[PDB]
Amino acid sequence: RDQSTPIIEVEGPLLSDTHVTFKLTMPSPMPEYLNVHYICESASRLLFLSMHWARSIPAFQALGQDCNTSLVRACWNELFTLGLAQCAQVMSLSTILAAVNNSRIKQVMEHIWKLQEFCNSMAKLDIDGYEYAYLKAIVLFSPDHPGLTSTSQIEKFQEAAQMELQDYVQATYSEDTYRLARILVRLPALRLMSSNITEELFFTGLIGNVSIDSIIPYILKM
Amino acid sequence: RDQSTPIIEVEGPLLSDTHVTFKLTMPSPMPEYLNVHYICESASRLLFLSMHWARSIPAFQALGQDCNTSLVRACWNELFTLGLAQCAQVMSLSTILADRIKQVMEHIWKLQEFCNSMAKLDIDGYEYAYLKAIVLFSPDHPGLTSTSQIEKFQEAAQMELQDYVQATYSEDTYRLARILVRLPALRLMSSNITEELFFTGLIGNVSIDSIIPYIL
Structure with a gap:
């Protein structure tokens, strides 16, 4: 009914002014050609770009590292997928590989x-x-x-x-x-x-x- | 877009703009006793009601019959949980003590x-x-x-x-x-x-x- 100090005795749950700023921008550059296993690196750029967008939120850093690192740990895939559709301009990933290769209803x-x-x-x-x-x-x-x-x-x-x-x-x-x-x-x-x-x-x-x-955690450092 | 006939012969009518007030009655008739494993009964009492609620809705049946017993079979937990935010029941949530991680x-x-x-x-x-x-x-x-x-x-x-x-x-x-x-x-x-x-x-x-699938 009245929270100026949180469940603990340190922080102070203060109300808001203007949440998200100019974050509406999200560019995603990419280097060279053909579909090897650089894919990993592609999803990384998004993954990385995603961590920063979020770490750049003036209301996100307020939560403090301990809380940030955990929050992100709880939804990186939602963000990644949200951005996936948003930057799907690239994704031609028909990465549907058909399954050592001598002279299993995985969905x-x-x-x-x-x-x-x-x-x-x-x-x-x-x-x-x-x-x-x-x-x-x-x-x-x-x-x-x-x-x-x-x-x-x-x-x-x-x-x-x-x-x-x-x-x-x-x-x-x-x-x-x-x-x-x-x-x-x-x-x-x-x-x-x-x-x-x-x-x-x-x-x-x-x-x-x-x-x-x-x-x-380390991606949130720099 | 533009979709009025599926990729076959059938078709899809637009909203009839209605879902009668009968789709508001969710009275779960609960037992009487103390807390044994009658939680399974209350659970079922809600499950069966929930599933029966979704079947009352016309748009449901109209959606064929196979599709029915496929859609609910795909969200029952969601409905049961939704309807579970209807505590006309008691504190069945004391499910206590149990090598486990206890998630x-x-x-x-x-x-x-x-x-x-x-x-x-x-x-x-x-x-x-x-x-x-x-x-x-x-x-x-x-x-x-x-x-x-x-x-x-x-x-x-x-x-x-x-x-x-x-x-x-x-x-x-x-x-x-x-x-x-x-x-x-x-x-x-x-x-x-x-x-x-x-x-x-x-x-x-x-x-x-x-x-x-065993609906009445």
Whole structure:
């Protein structure tokens, strides 16, 4: 009913001003040709670019490293996939490899399916850069995942994010009222997709063996 | 886009703009005694009601019959959990003591916080029913048939739920959003643990993903 100091006796859950700033930008450059196993590096650029976008949020750094590192550890795959559809301009990854080679109903197909279908849905809805920046925001500041240390602070961020995201849709797309809701009903799809299947498929090269989850903390350093 | 006939002969009609008030009645008739393994019964009492609620809805049956027993079989946990935020029951959540890592706890937590947050938001009317529609008619799920038609239903429920909120409120204009950003939680809990926790007192091994087709 009245939280100026969180469950603990250190922080102070302070309300918001203006959440996300100019983060609406997200470029993703890439070097040379043909489909070897540089894929790992491609997904890395996104993965990396994703960690920074989030670490750059004036309300994210407030949570402190201990809380940040954990939050991100709880949704990197949602962010990665959100951005996947947003930068899907590259992905020609028909990485459906058919299974030592002397003189097993693994459903990785479903995951790839859901993945394509989600990108597609978001394309069909023509989600713009702004909505993406906020959609990622609503995802990042989820009070659902267990193991989070912020109390109502995180809650107060998701509130603003969805708040500020209703406003942008409210104006920018006045011909469509049921659009916002149409966008929010996409978020559940991000949870249906397994983080592991996503890791096995993209990150295998170098980052693949080390467990992206353990590397997260260092990616948040620089 | 442009979709009026699937990739065959059949077709997809647009919303009839309706889902009768009978889709608001969720009274779970519970037992009488103390807390034995009757939690499995209350669980079933809710499961069977939940599944029977989704079948009352016309758009459901119209969606063929195979597709029916495929869609619900793909979200039952979500519905049961949604409807589980309807504690006309007691403290069945004391599921205590158990070599294990006991991840179960974490699950009880999620289900706990969810029921809390749902209650904190006061789900006025049975927006639950409409949220159960958004859940029921999810195109996300694999192995689904009339995908496009389901989208039409889910799209319907999306609009109606909206027209019920901003038309039944003023002070909270950001409600719709708020109540929508809750759905993802539902996909954050495993059905396995749910089945393993509540329906842990049924005839031997029978998995819920089996008894589903047996609808009356």
